[PDB]
Amino acid sequence: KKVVLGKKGDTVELTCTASQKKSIQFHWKNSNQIKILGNYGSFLWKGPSKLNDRADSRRSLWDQGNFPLIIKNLKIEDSDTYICEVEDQKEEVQLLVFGLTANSDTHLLQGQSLTLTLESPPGSSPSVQCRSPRGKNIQGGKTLSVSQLELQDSGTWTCTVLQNQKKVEFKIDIVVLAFQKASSIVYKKEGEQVEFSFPLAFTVEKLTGSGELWWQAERASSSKSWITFDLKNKEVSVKRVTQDPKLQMGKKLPLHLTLPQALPQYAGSGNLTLALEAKTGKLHQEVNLVVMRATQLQKNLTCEVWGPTSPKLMLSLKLENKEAKVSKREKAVWVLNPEAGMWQCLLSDSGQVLLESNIKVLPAA
Amino acid sequence: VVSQHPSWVIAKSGTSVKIECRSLDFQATTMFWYRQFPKQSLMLMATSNEGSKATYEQGVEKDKFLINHASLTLSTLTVTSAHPEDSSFYICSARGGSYNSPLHFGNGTRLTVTEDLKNVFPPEVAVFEPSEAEISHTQKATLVCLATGFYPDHVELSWWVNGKEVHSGVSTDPQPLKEQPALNDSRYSLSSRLRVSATFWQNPRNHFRCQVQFYGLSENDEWTQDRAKPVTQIVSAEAWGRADC
Amino acid sequence: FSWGAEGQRPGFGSGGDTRPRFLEQVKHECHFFNGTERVRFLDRYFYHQEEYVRFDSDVGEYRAVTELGRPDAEYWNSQKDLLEQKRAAVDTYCRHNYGVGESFTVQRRVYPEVTVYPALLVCSVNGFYPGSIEVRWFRNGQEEKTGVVSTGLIQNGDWTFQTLVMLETVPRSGEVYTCQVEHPSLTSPLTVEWR
Amino acid sequence: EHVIIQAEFYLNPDQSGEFMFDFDGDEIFHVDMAKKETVWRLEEFGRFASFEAQGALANIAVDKANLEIMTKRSNYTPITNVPPEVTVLTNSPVELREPNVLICFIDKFTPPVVNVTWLRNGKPVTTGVSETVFLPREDHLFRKFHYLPFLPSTEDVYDCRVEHWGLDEPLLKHWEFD
Amino acid sequence: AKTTQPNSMESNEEEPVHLPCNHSTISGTDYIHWYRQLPSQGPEYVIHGLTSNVNNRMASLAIAEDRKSSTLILHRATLRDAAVYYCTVYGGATNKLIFGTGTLLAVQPNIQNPDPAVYQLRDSKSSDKSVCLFTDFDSQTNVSQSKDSDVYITDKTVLDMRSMDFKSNSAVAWSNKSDFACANNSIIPEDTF
């Protein structure tokens, strides 16, 4: 006959009503023949039933023929077929309870899986479903998981179990932690300082994890460059970084990697990695740095670029005088006769501009 | 902190004396009204719990004293049907709550109530310059100030050296004394001493000024007598540094 | 002699039949785990139903039960003295009061006048303190554990208690039922019978 | 395994307040207001404790001032009404021509203001009735007890009447010797 | 009647002064407060404690094992400690602060130089021929008198010159009378003029 569903830990009230409206005799029975709650006169009696005090009812509602049986803080096992006997009536009902848990409460990080486990009662045949924060809807099953969380998918979800055409509500917050970055590119001169920092999902915490940045370069492969730090409760506090480019931390994140100067070899990419006391530590971003040198010795103007510099772009030299004496896609600028004046050393592509620098030319003596 | 206004006051053989108490900062849930008679002790007259029937400790004159305690701050202890036998030291206190809440006191209001303004006089103030007797002996110079012929005893006698007050060398008498240790309504006298370096008084440049603050009265007092109008004032005597004869 | 009490203090600001009602509620609690051994004092405060600011003897300072009570929390914990009083609560307030009433409340005991009667047998226990009590039905030296039921513990507000324990059964001609009461007012298991 | 609660409350606009000690659900004593004296819910505690009197009031007036403030913290949010839950029962089992007491159970209500009537057949008669002040519950709702000394006539029908703003109209819970 | 104290008690400047308080027996939860009062002004707080012992600035506090008795300690007594010291009970069983009978402490100044005399002052306003003055005398001396009834005298009171670190007891005797003259006063130390 009828059935009502409720979430584990909730409070469900299944009604029973006798046509005649008066306070009268009644009692409730669990599936196999056991008295639970009952009334004798204006008295209330709880029976041998395993529910003990967990069950009650509204005495004020007794006047007219409403005689409800409630339950506080359910459990899976509470699921059963309940009877109600009043003025010779068999009115029936059935309770199915469910529960939904994440594998881990701690905030997950970018690209890490999340396995949602459904708790079914004996004698049930349910299914699942989820409305993500972005509206994205993934259909589950006996158990459902969404792997590789997107920061876009971080927020309050809503999970739907469906049984006997009656909905059941489940809301779980998520808010994945992460870097705003994952591409960081900075172009600078030979003497110019270079620095960058990185964004996050920004909460308080404490005693949280550690981290470090592992260098790559062009010149001298077999790239190593530890460059390590330790973050705890907003304290950065360098972890014994490298001496190659002799740099400093700026502890107390935001985390600013400092460099004295951008040299030719320091050109390269590498990537930055973060871990935290909440385990599964794959959070990481990256870094990209490219350097240009304008030095002109004697007649030779030689000017060249290092770094990744995706090799579709255009390196040129013009001066606002005759257009681009030598312009191609490559890292080397060659011009023999150094026409006097300060030229413009072109770096960038059909893109706007990147890393522009210039020097002068004095004719002879 | 709490202030008691007015600090001094006097009225007719009967009158309305409205004594306030104000908690300048904190909310006052409770008010304690203590009165103290000369060299006796602190007696508890009443208890005012905010917006309630004020509980008077046993042995009180009942409706004689009335507490208006108003919101959290303004608290009015008003005594009508004035009596000479009721002139006393009235002290009020505020509380930041119930049991074991620090009891915060105030200045306290010294009050004399007589049967007419014919007993009210201001002080007659004259100084006394030292004697080179003391000089020749202790190499120090001790002035003396005598403010007499006043009522009530409420006064504050302070000193001014070079036009600026001094807390050192100054010793005033503790309690002004009766000129008539008989008469019911008498007039009083007060003598304060200021002692300085013998030579400090020998230089005529130094400015020595003795002052007495008398709180008698105000305009609202009905004044018949043709004589002086004994209201709150500052009477003073003086002299400069003395040369050497 | 001399039963003692606790006290509260202001908040931030000041103040001043179908009329809309307002309600303030202050509960100084206490909790005693087996006597004067580990003791948990509670100073609560409310608005209508909702609890806003609190003090847990185990947290040593005022916490907040809602952003609605946030200010008062910071306000009181800013007062050095008061916190040194409430911190001593368990010893000045709880142990004390308990010490006065260790006689006439804790150790207070009264006999369970017991009756019985069909309406199905009924067993009516009355006028007993405390209310910690066992009532079990017996059919001929056997204990009948099923088909029973209890009105549970009831309260009369006069310090007496009461309970109705029903037994649903069908007898025959010469068996004997029993209703047995053990309350720590009794050296013996008070009983009653029916035939 | 034990509780000593001193619960107090101030109520506006009614401007009534209560001071009491609930020990394990049954009252110990409550300082009366007008009277301004100690009143035990049972007298046997009469000479042991001896509580202060005006002492209560100090708290109360406080709780008032707390209420004044706490009201302006909510932007003047009124009380959510609550209905009581009433059942009437006999102290001991009711016998014939034996002394006894009706006990009127009003529970799970708030604010703490109620009008109770002891009437038979509709005859509003009170002979030495009894009423305990408001007992605090777990949910900080309220409890209360009206007693009614009486004799078990198969004739009479005694009735209990409780008026509260929670029920849109007065409640009548009856009882009859059966 | 809450707690009992000795009416009045004497000390000496710089000397440690111990103030006795016996209260009867006091209830389980009540603090012991000690309030004092400048000669004329409101009273003011001093110190308090449940049991054990407590000290802060301005004083220390001695509570007996059984909490039957308490003792206010003044380590180094200054002239400003002269005042009345009340011993009271405030706490869970007492909402009201009930002011006791009191202990009056007078602290005696040590005079450096016992060279007493009596100097007749000259008038400024030229008003009264009165003034003969009595100063710089041992603190073992008390002043006098009346009894002339036309003649006025005051209780010996201490002055302190901070610059020179000098304390001396100076009383004063003045009158308007024919016969009234210096030495004719009721009792004194030997040295004069």
JSON list of N, CA and C in Angstrom, two decimals, chain A residues 146-183:
[
{"chain": "A", "resi": 146, "resn": "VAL", "atom": "N", "xyz": [32.13, 10.88, -9.30]},
{"chain": "A", "resi": 146, "resn": "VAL", "atom": "CA", "xyz": [32.57, 11.83, -10.31]},
{"chain": "A", "resi": 146, "resn": "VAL", "atom": "C", "xyz": [34.07, 12.10, -10.14]},
{"chain": "A", "resi": 147, "resn": "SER", "atom": "N", "xyz": [34.87, 11.55, -11.05]},
{"chain": "A", "resi": 147, "resn": "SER", "atom": "CA", "xyz": [36.33, 11.69, -11.00]},
{"chain": "A", "resi": 147, "resn": "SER", "atom": "C", "xyz": [36.80, 13.03, -11.56]},
{"chain": "A", "resi": 148, "resn": "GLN", "atom": "N", "xyz": [37.98, 13.47, -11.12]},
{"chain": "A", "resi": 148, "resn": "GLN", "atom": "CA", "xyz": [38.61, 14.65, -11.68]},
{"chain": "A", "resi": 148, "resn": "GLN", "atom": "C", "xyz": [37.73, 15.89, -11.56]},
{"chain": "A", "resi": 149, "resn": "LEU", "atom": "N", "xyz": [37.51, 16.31, -10.32]},
{"chain": "A", "resi": 149, "resn": "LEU", "atom": "CA", "xyz": [36.69, 17.47, -10.02]},
{"chain": "A", "resi": 149, "resn": "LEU", "atom": "C", "xyz": [37.23, 18.72, -10.69]},
{"chain": "A", "resi": 150, "resn": "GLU", "atom": "N", "xyz": [36.35, 19.45, -11.37]},
{"chain": "A", "resi": 150, "resn": "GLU", "atom": "CA", "xyz": [36.70, 20.76, -11.90]},
{"chain": "A", "resi": 150, "resn": "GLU", "atom": "C", "xyz": [36.41, 21.83, -10.86]},
{"chain": "A", "resi": 151, "resn": "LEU", "atom": "N", "xyz": [37.27, 22.83, -10.77]},
{"chain": "A", "resi": 151, "resn": "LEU", "atom": "CA", "xyz": [37.04, 23.95, -9.86]},
{"chain": "A", "resi": 151, "resn": "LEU", "atom": "C", "xyz": [35.68, 24.56, -10.16]},
{"chain": "A", "resi": 152, "resn": "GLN", "atom": "N", "xyz": [35.24, 24.38, -11.40]},
{"chain": "A", "resi": 152, "resn": "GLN", "atom": "CA", "xyz": [33.94, 24.88, -11.86]},
{"chain": "A", "resi": 152, "resn": "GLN", "atom": "C", "xyz": [32.81, 24.09, -11.22]},
{"chain": "A", "resi": 153, "resn": "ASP", "atom": "N", "xyz": [33.10, 22.83, -10.90]},
{"chain": "A", "resi": 153, "resn": "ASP", "atom": "CA", "xyz": [32.11, 21.93, -10.33]},
{"chain": "A", "resi": 153, "resn": "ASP", "atom": "C", "xyz": [32.12, 21.99, -8.80]},
{"chain": "A", "resi": 154, "resn": "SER", "atom": "N", "xyz": [32.89, 22.91, -8.24]},
{"chain": "A", "resi": 154, "resn": "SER", "atom": "CA", "xyz": [33.00, 23.04, -6.78]},
{"chain": "A", "resi": 154, "resn": "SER", "atom": "C", "xyz": [31.88, 23.89, -6.18]},
{"chain": "A", "resi": 155, "resn": "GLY", "atom": "N", "xyz": [31.07, 23.28, -5.33]},
{"chain": "A", "resi": 155, "resn": "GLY", "atom": "CA", "xyz": [29.95, 23.96, -4.72]},
{"chain": "A", "resi": 155, "resn": "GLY", "atom": "C", "xyz": [28.96, 22.97, -4.13]},
{"chain": "A", "resi": 156, "resn": "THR", "atom": "N", "xyz": [27.76, 23.45, -3.80]},
{"chain": "A", "resi": 156, "resn": "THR", "atom": "CA", "xyz": [26.75, 22.61, -3.18]},
{"chain": "A", "resi": 156, "resn": "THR", "atom": "C", "xyz": [26.06, 21.74, -4.22]},
{"chain": "A", "resi": 157, "resn": "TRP", "atom": "N", "xyz": [26.18, 20.43, -4.07]},
{"chain": "A", "resi": 157, "resn": "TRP", "atom": "CA", "xyz": [25.53, 19.51, -4.99]},
{"chain": "A", "resi": 157, "resn": "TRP", "atom": "C", "xyz": [24.15, 19.17, -4.47]},
{"chain": "A", "resi": 158, "resn": "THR", "atom": "N", "xyz": [23.38, 18.45, -5.26]},
{"chain": "A", "resi": 158, "resn": "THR", "atom": "CA", "xyz": [22.09, 17.93, -4.81]},
{"chain": "A", "resi": 158, "resn": "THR", "atom": "C", "xyz": [21.89, 16.52, -5.35]},
{"chain": "A", "resi": 159, "resn": "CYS", "atom": "N", "xyz": [21.69, 15.56, -4.45]},
{"chain": "A", "resi": 159, "resn": "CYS", "atom": "CA", "xyz": [21.56, 14.17, -4.87]},
{"chain": "A", "resi": 159, "resn": "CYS", "atom": "C", "xyz": [20.15, 13.62, -4.69]},
{"chain": "A", "resi": 160, "resn": "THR", "atom": "N", "xyz": [19.68, 12.92, -5.72]},
{"chain": "A", "resi": 160, "resn": "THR", "atom": "CA", "xyz": [18.31, 12.43, -5.75]},
{"chain": "A", "resi": 160, "resn": "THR", "atom": "C", "xyz": [18.24, 10.92, -5.81]},
{"chain": "A", "resi": 161, "resn": "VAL", "atom": "N", "xyz": [17.67, 10.30, -4.79]},
{"chain": "A", "resi": 161, "resn": "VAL", "atom": "CA", "xyz": [17.33, 8.89, -4.85]},
{"chain": "A", "resi": 161, "resn": "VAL", "atom": "C", "xyz": [15.86, 8.77, -5.23]},
{"chain": "A", "resi": 162, "resn": "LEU", "atom": "N", "xyz": [15.52, 7.76, -6.03]},
{"chain": "A", "resi": 162, "resn": "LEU", "atom": "CA", "xyz": [14.15, 7.61, -6.49]},
{"chain": "A", "resi": 162, "resn": "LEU", "atom": "C", "xyz": [13.59, 6.22, -6.22]},
{"chain": "A", "resi": 163, "resn": "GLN", "atom": "N", "xyz": [12.51, 6.20, -5.45]},
{"chain": "A", "resi": 163, "resn": "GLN", "atom": "CA", "xyz": [11.84, 4.96, -5.08]},
{"chain": "A", "resi": 163, "resn": "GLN", "atom": "C", "xyz": [10.34, 5.18, -5.04]},
{"chain": "A", "resi": 164, "resn": "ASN", "atom": "N", "xyz": [9.59, 4.29, -5.67]},
{"chain": "A", "resi": 164, "resn": "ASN", "atom": "CA", "xyz": [8.13, 4.35, -5.63]},
{"chain": "A", "resi": 164, "resn": "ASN", "atom": "C", "xyz": [7.62, 5.76, -5.94]},
{"chain": "A", "resi": 165, "resn": "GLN", "atom": "N", "xyz": [8.30, 6.43, -6.87]},
{"chain": "A", "resi": 165, "resn": "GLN", "atom": "CA", "xyz": [7.86, 7.75, -7.35]},
{"chain": "A", "resi": 165, "resn": "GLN", "atom": "C", "xyz": [7.82, 8.83, -6.27]},
{"chain": "A", "resi": 166, "resn": "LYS", "atom": "N", "xyz": [8.78, 8.80, -5.35]},
{"chain": "A", "resi": 166, "resn": "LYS", "atom": "CA", "xyz": [8.84, 9.80, -4.29]},
{"chain": "A", "resi": 166, "resn": "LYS", "atom": "C", "xyz": [10.28, 10.27, -4.06]},
{"chain": "A", "resi": 167, "resn": "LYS", "atom": "N", "xyz": [10.49, 11.58, -4.17]},
{"chain": "A", "resi": 167, "resn": "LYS", "atom": "CA", "xyz": [11.83, 12.15, -4.11]},
{"chain": "A", "resi": 167, "resn": "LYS", "atom": "C", "xyz": [12.40, 12.18, -2.69]},
{"chain": "A", "resi": 168, "resn": "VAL", "atom": "N", "xyz": [13.73, 12.13, -2.59]},
{"chain": "A", "resi": 168, "resn": "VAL", "atom": "CA", "xyz": [14.42, 12.27, -1.31]},
{"chain": "A", "resi": 168, "resn": "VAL", "atom": "C", "xyz": [15.66, 13.18, -1.43]},
{"chain": "A", "resi": 169, "resn": "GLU", "atom": "N", "xyz": [15.73, 14.19, -0.57]},
{"chain": "A", "resi": 169, "resn": "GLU", "atom": "CA", "xyz": [16.72, 15.27, -0.71]},
{"chain": "A", "resi": 169, "resn": "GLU", "atom": "C", "xyz": [18.07, 14.98, -0.07]},
{"chain": "A", "resi": 170, "resn": "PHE", "atom": "N", "xyz": [19.14, 15.23, -0.81]},
{"chain": "A", "resi": 170, "resn": "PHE", "atom": "CA", "xyz": [20.48, 15.18, -0.25]},
{"chain": "A", "resi": 170, "resn": "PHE", "atom": "C", "xyz": [21.36, 16.33, -0.74]},
{"chain": "A", "resi": 171, "resn": "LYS", "atom": "N", "xyz": [21.82, 17.19, 0.17]},
{"chain": "A", "resi": 171, "resn": "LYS", "atom": "CA", "xyz": [22.72, 18.27, -0.21]},
{"chain": "A", "resi": 171, "resn": "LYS", "atom": "C", "xyz": [24.08, 18.15, 0.47]},
{"chain": "A", "resi": 172, "resn": "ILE", "atom": "N", "xyz": [25.14, 18.17, -0.34]},
{"chain": "A", "resi": 172, "resn": "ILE", "atom": "CA", "xyz": [26.51, 18.10, 0.19]},
{"chain": "A", "resi": 172, "resn": "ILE", "atom": "C", "xyz": [27.41, 19.18, -0.42]},
{"chain": "A", "resi": 173, "resn": "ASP", "atom": "N", "xyz": [28.06, 19.96, 0.44]},
{"chain": "A", "resi": 173, "resn": "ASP", "atom": "CA", "xyz": [28.96, 21.01, -0.01]},
{"chain": "A", "resi": 173, "resn": "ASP", "atom": "C", "xyz": [30.31, 20.43, -0.42]},
{"chain": "A", "resi": 174, "resn": "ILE", "atom": "N", "xyz": [30.99, 21.07, -1.38]},
{"chain": "A", "resi": 174, "resn": "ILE", "atom": "CA", "xyz": [32.29, 20.58, -1.86]},
{"chain": "A", "resi": 174, "resn": "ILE", "atom": "C", "xyz": [33.44, 21.61, -1.94]},
{"chain": "A", "resi": 175, "resn": "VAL", "atom": "N", "xyz": [33.28, 22.64, -2.77]},
{"chain": "A", "resi": 175, "resn": "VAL", "atom": "CA", "xyz": [34.28, 23.72, -2.87]},
{"chain": "A", "resi": 175, "resn": "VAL", "atom": "C", "xyz": [35.72, 23.20, -2.90]},
{"chain": "A", "resi": 176, "resn": "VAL", "atom": "N", "xyz": [36.08, 22.58, -4.02]},
{"chain": "A", "resi": 176, "resn": "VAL", "atom": "CA", "xyz": [37.44, 22.13, -4.32]},
{"chain": "A", "resi": 176, "resn": "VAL", "atom": "C", "xyz": [38.53, 23.22, -4.19]},
{"chain": "A", "resi": 177, "resn": "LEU", "atom": "N", "xyz": [39.64, 22.89, -3.52]},
{"chain": "A", "resi": 177, "resn": "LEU", "atom": "CA", "xyz": [40.80, 23.77, -3.43]},
{"chain": "A", "resi": 177, "resn": "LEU", "atom": "C", "xyz": [41.68, 23.71, -4.69]},
{"chain": "A", "resi": 178, "resn": "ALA", "atom": "N", "xyz": [42.40, 24.79, -4.99]},
{"chain": "A", "resi": 178, "resn": "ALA", "atom": "CA", "xyz": [43.20, 24.84, -6.23]},
{"chain": "A", "resi": 178, "resn": "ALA", "atom": "C", "xyz": [43.96, 26.13, -6.51]},
{"chain": "A", "resi": 179, "resn": "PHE", "atom": "N", "xyz": [44.70, 26.13, -7.63]},
{"chain": "A", "resi": 179, "resn": "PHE", "atom": "CA", "xyz": [45.41, 27.29, -8.16]},
{"chain": "A", "resi": 179, "resn": "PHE", "atom": "C", "xyz": [44.58, 27.99, -9.24]},
{"chain": "A", "resi": 180, "resn": "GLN", "atom": "N", "xyz": [44.53, 29.31, -9.22]},
{"chain": "A", "resi": 180, "resn": "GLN", "atom": "CA", "xyz": [43.85, 30.06, -10.28]},
{"chain": "A", "resi": 180, "resn": "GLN", "atom": "C", "xyz": [44.60, 29.90, -11.58]},
{"chain": "A", "resi": 181, "resn": "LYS", "atom": "N", "xyz": [45.90, 29.70, -11.42]},
{"chain": "A", "resi": 181, "resn": "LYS", "atom": "CA", "xyz": [46.90, 29.52, -12.47]},
{"chain": "A", "resi": 181, "resn": "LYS", "atom": "C", "xyz": [46.93, 28.09, -13.03]},
{"chain": "A", "resi": 182, "resn": "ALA", "atom": "N", "xyz": [48.13, 27.63, -13.41]},
{"chain": "A", "resi": 182, "resn": "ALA", "atom": "CA", "xyz": [48.38, 26.48, -14.29]},
{"chain": "A", "resi": 182, "resn": "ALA", "atom": "C", "xyz": [48.82, 26.86, -15.70]},
{"chain": "A", "resi": 183, "resn": "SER", "atom": "N", "xyz": [48.87, 28.15, -15.99]},
{"chain": "A", "resi": 183, "resn": "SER", "atom": "CA", "xyz": [49.87, 28.64, -16.93]},
{"chain": "A", "resi": 183, "resn": "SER", "atom": "C", "xyz": [50.38, 30.00, -16.47]}
]
